[PDB]
């Protein structure tokens, strides 16, 4: 997260860290959505141009964390993956369209002050909150700078940007399964997700029912916190039928 701040304790209890077993390192961010399901970006697990294709046994999920590097004894929980599920039309060849994946855990994680699931949106939540200007919140343990490493989880609030502005900011082909967020040059304020924040949640707090909903997943960008550039997020609601379908079946 560039130009964000230190998260408060328990401010993002759905925050998940995807951790490589060997070598023991940060792989991505991710989200807790139930006691056995974790949501992330597909590109976190599969991206052939970079020879990335993780299997279950290559990684671990760590839940309840604040500290990036430390083992948080009596606070975090570490879970093993039973099975990975990547969107069958995820487009790693061109623009990361349908950049989304689910992980089922071998055993349920216990909820605590530091561990709690985020809601997923239904049509009305999306209708009402996915508006240009409305701010969401992105969190992660990724780089603090485009060209570093945070001590604790970082957070930053960012406004959703108008679809034509997103489009005009890049040469990449934008789909309806994506949205972009970030401040414009004239807005003075700054912030962005960056390398290692990948797979993490973009959340919004419903002013109707005071609940947090994950509207997006950190997916891609050009540099980090560049002027005139914007972070792009998977549109969670647009892929929810797939999510329902996977969880309903498995």
């Amino acid at each position: 997260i560039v130009e964000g701040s230190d998260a408060e304790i328990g401010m993002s209890p759905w925050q998940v860290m995807l951790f490589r077993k060997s070598p023991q390192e940060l792989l991505c961010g991710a989200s807790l959505i139930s006691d056995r399901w974790v949501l992330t970006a597909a590109h976190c697990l599969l991206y052939p141009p970079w020879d990335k294709n993780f299997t279950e046994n290559d990684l671990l999920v760590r839940i309840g964390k604040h500290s990036r590097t430390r083992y948080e004894r009596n606070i975090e929980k570490i879970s093993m993956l039973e099975k990975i599920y990547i969107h069958p039309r995820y487009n790693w060849r061109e623009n990361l369209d349908r950049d989304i994946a689910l992980m089922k855990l071998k055993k349920p994680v216990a909820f605590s002050d530091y561990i709690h699931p985020v809601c997923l949106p239904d049509r009305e939540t999306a209708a009402s909150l996915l508006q240009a200007g409305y701010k969401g919140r992105v969190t992660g343990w990724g780089n603090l700078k485009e060209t570093g490493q945070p001590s604790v989880l970082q957070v930053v609030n960012l406004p959703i940007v108008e679809r034509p502005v997103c489009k005009d900011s890049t040469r990449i082909r934008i789909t309806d399964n994506m949205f972009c967020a970030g401040y414009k040059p004239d807005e003075g304020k700054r912030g962005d997700a960056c390398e290692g924040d990948s797979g993490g949640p973009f959340v919004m707090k419903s002013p109707f029912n005071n609940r947090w909903y994950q509207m997006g997943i950190v997916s891609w960008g050009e540099g980090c916190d560049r002027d005139g550039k914007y972070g792009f997020y998977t549109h969670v609601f647009r892929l929810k039928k797939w999510i329902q379908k996977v969880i309903d079946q498995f």
Binding site: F19, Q24, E25, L60, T69, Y71, I78, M80
Partner: peptide, 10 residues
């Protein structure tokens, strides 16, 4: 860098 985690977890 990363503090070691319990071998329990592999």
């Amino acid at each position: 860098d990363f503090e070691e985690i319990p071998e329990e977890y592999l």
